[PDB]
Design a binder for this molecule. Structure first.
Ligand SMILES: *[C@@H]1O[C@H](CO)[C@@H](O[C@@H]2O[C@H](CO)[C@@H](O)[C@H](O)[C@H]2NC(C)=O)[C@H](O)[C@H]1NC(C)=O
Lengths: 11, 179, 188
């Protein structure tokens, strides 16, 4: 049902 | 590889504008209107099938923005090199006089991702029923964009697609007319 | 105007044989330059240019991080794949095919034939040209696949021949939207 986001890392 | 899905986002200074979208085999699945914080589906249909929490995109942009500020410093503030776009105009299908069709303006291989696109018909700019797509990714890390102009074939009316890009020496016009 | 500074992020998922094999790529770019990335095939972060070397070193020391990104092929890639498959991987729209003569010159002269295939999806498509049944493999030029940016492709394939009365030219399109190949004939 839901498309998941890939959360990036903070430099 | 039979298929590829890409989650592509970006933040740009000093324009302070960002985008978040999904690509399936070169097509846009959806994108998030950063302003209204609303998931926008390329095809009105997809909406009924899948769902996307817009807030997710906002949080991500915040991350991109922060890395940009840092990377921008640790790189002696070197600017991006403007790369002028290649433009192409084509019809949705074979043109038949007085038979609804669509003009397609395909802007490709450009960066940064900023452009002013306008549809000209016999000089005068049209905006009735036009549509476009956010910026789409590329292997070379450049951008693609589509603009659509629904029209009515005729022997008179001529059409133009105007593209303003900081890489161009002046507005670029790709012409299209019936023979 | 003033100089622009750009930050690009790309989360890529590559699928082969269904989801039998999946590849996850998290790539970081600054002004059109990728500097650090995660490759599920490698397992950890890597630099693509010197600015990334320091970054990678930091991230790769956070076990919880690598651990999370290594599961991305599953929690992110294979998951999303299941959520969109029915309307992307399975999406199928039949090709609209039309034939017509191009250019223009009186009897006994130059002439071309056009086969316009449009509005189909996916893009994978095959087109051939026949003359009185025999397949033509000479005077054929194609525009190649052409995206329309609206989940539909279009292609134009031409054939240069000298039309003779009574002849029959056929355009054949094979595509995933049709069990049997489509054909459009033009008679000289
Ligand atoms: C897109 O169009 C806008 C509108 O004109 C451009 O922005 C203006 O650019 C002029 C320089 O010619 C400035 O003097 C104005 O102040 C700008 N408007 C404002 C206040 O934003 C912009 O440069 C164009 N961008 C592209 C892609 O060429």
């Amino acid at each position: 049902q839901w498309i998941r986001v890939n959360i990036p890392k903070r430099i | 590889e039979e298929h590829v899905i890409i989650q592509a986002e970006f933040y740009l200074n000093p324009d302070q504008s960002g985008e978040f979208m999904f690509d399936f085999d070169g097509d846009e699945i959806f994108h998030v209107d950063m302003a209204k914080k609303e998931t926008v589906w390329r095809l009105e249909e997809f909406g009924r099938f899948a769902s996307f929490e817009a807030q997710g995109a906002l949080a991500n942009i915040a991350v991109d923005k922060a890395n940009l500020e840092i990377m921008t410093k640790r790189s002696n503030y070197t600017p991006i090199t403007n790369v002028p776009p290649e433009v192409t105009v084509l019809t949705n299908s074979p043109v038949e006089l007085r038979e609804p069709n669509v003009l397609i303006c395909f802007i490709d291989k450009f960066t940064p991702p900023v452009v002013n696109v306008t549809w000209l018909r016999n000089g005068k700019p049209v905006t009735t029923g036009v549509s476009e797509t956010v910026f789409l990714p590329r292997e070379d890390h450049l951008f693609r964009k589509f603009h659509y102009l629904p029209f009515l074939p005729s022997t008179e009316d001529v059409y133009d697609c105007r593209v303003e890009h900081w890489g161009l020496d002046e507005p670029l016009l790709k012409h299209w007319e019936f023979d | 105007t003033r100089p622009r500074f750009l930050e690009l992020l790309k989360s890529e998922c590559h699928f082969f044989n269904g989801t039998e094999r999946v590849r996850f790529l998290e790539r970081y770019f600054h002004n059109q330059e990728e500097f650090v990335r995660f490759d599920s095939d490698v397992g950890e972060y890597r630099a693509v240019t010197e600015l990334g070397r320091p970054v990678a070193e930091s991230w790769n020391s956070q076990k919880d991080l690598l651990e999370q990104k290594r599961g991305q092929v599953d929690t992110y890639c294979r998951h999303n794949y299941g959520v969109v498959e029915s309307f992307t991987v399975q999406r199928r729209v039949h090709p609209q095919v039309t034939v017509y003569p191009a250019k223009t010159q009186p009897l006994q002269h130059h002439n071309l034939l056009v086969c316009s295939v449009s509005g189909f999806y996916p893009g994978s498509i095959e087109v051939r040209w026949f003359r009185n049944g025999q397949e033509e493999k000479t005077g054929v030029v194609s525009t190649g696949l052409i995206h329309n940016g609206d989940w539909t492709f279009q292609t134009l394939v031409m054939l240069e021949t000298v039309p003779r009365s009574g002849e029959v030219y056929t355009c054949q399109v094979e595509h995933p939207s049709v069990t049997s190949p489509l054909t459009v004939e033009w008679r000289a």
